[PDB]
Amino acid sequence: KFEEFMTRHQVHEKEEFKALKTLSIFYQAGTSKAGNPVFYYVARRFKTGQINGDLLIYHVLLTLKPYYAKPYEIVVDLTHTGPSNRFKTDFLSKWFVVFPGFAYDNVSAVYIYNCNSWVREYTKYHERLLTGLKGSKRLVFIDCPGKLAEHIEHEQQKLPAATLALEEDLKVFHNALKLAHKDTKVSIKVGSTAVQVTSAERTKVLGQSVFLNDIYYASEIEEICLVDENQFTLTIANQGTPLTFMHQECEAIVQSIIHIRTRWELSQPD
């Protein structure tokens, strides 16, 4: 939309805008197996309050400008995406008008990576705006890290190194159950830096059945309570409501998590 294009050009690229590039929130990297240019959006790298929306969306416009006249694909990294990264209602709706019609058409495929519970609720709450994304063949959720290789060569992939690191050396606990108004089978994976709870059964997101992956850095873990011989709880910072899980070896799970919370506290800024 050149009307927004020029409104953003009456004052040329400032020095805050140029900072967006260095933080690698949206960038082009690699080519897909289909022979299309790939772009990456690292959701967790956007802070609602800290980052000016108009600059971001404009930074994306300049990035896609040269490419979006032809086929191209987007990889959306939803790793550890939470409230602090959300696009507020009014800002979210901008994305549907600021780009040319063909730019939207030329998107060959969108690859959703590490979709989580919060994002699901987000799409739930913004079900209106995202109806065009509902049951779309272009929308492709990555069940597990290994399936992305089906669309993009492993070497052509360029996810944030921090994202890939979350897939290394995990103590995995299968057959766990997440207790709530609605029970759900999950796997509880403990890493040196965080804890990941992956749904063992598919769930609905934007019309598709997918696997969610909730990530909690050790820094977010406040309270760790062992309730029973097969039940424990986690208190996540700024989340309020405690998470409850059931597992045969809750004693081993808690110890494992306490350890990573400790190793973290040790190496911290005094």
Ligand X SMILES: CCCCCCCCCCCCCCCCCC(=O)O[C@H](COC(=O)CCCCCCCCCCCCCCC)COP(=O)(O)OCCN
Which residue in 165, 216, 174, 176 sits closest to 194, CA to CA? 216
Please report how close the Cβ of residue 165 comes to its own copies at its closest, in angstroms.
4
The one segment of 3-11, 115-123, 186-194, 238-246 that binds ligand X by CB under 6 A: 115-123
Cβ proximity to Na ion: between 148 and 234 the closer is: 148
Residues 174-203 that bind its own copies (CB under 8 A): 192-194
Q: Considering beta carbons, is residue 103 or 226 the nearer one to ligand X?
A: 103
Figure out which of the listed residues 3, 12, 35, 161 binds Na ion, where binding follows CB under 5 A. Answer: 35
Query: Pick from its own copies, ligand X, Na ion, none: which does 35 bind, CB < 5 to 8 A by kind?
Result: Na ion
Is residue 135 near Na ion by the rule CB under 5 A?
no
Q: Which stretch binds ligand X (CB under 6 A): 28-36, 131-139, 146-154, 195-203?
A: 131-139
Distance CA 232, CA 241 (A): 14
Q: Smaller CB distance to Na ion: residue 34 or 69?
A: 34
Number of CB atoms found within 10 A of residue 137's CB:
7
Please select the residue that binds ligand X; options are 51, 62, 103, 227, rule is CB under 6 A.
103
Q: Which of residues 8-67 bind ligand X (CB under 6 A)?
A: 41, 43, 60
Identified binder of ligand X from the candidate list 17, 58, 87, 211, rule CB under 6 A:
87
Q: Does 91 bind ligand X (CB under 6 A)?
A: no
DSSP per-residue codes, the chain: -HHHHHHTTSS---SSHHHHHHTTSEEEEEE-TTS-EEEEEEGGG--TTTS-HHHHHHHHHHHHTTTTTS-EEEEEE-TT--GGGPPPHHHHHHTTTSS-HHHHHTEEEEEEES--HHHHHHHHHTTTTTGGGTT-SSEEE-SSGGGGGGTS-GGG----HHHHHTTSS-EEEEEEEEESSS-EEEEEEE-SSEEEEEESS-EEETTEEE--EEEEETTTEEEEEEEETTEEEEEETTT-SPEEEE-TTHHHHHHHHHHHHHHHHHSS--
Selected binder of ligand X within 32, 36, 85, 213 (CB under 6 A): 85
Shortest distance (Å) from residue 94 CB to ligand X:
9
**Cβ–Cβ under 8 Å, residues 252 and 258:** no
Q: Which of 32, 85, 123, 196 binds its own copies (CB under 8 A)?
A: 85
Q: From CA 135, how far away is CA 62, in angstroms rounded?
A: 29
* C-beta of 85 vs 199, nearer to its own copies: 85
User: Which of its own copies, Na ion, ligand X, none lies near 41, with the C-beta cut-off 5 to 8 A by kind?
Assistant: ligand X
Nearer to its own copies, 37 or 191 (CB): 191
Q: Which residues bind ligand X (CB under 6 A)?
A: 41, 43, 60, 74, 76, 81, 85-87, 92, 95-96, 99, 103-104, 107, 110, 112, 119, 122-123, 132-133, 136
Q: Which residues bind Na ion (CB under 5 A)?
A: 34-36
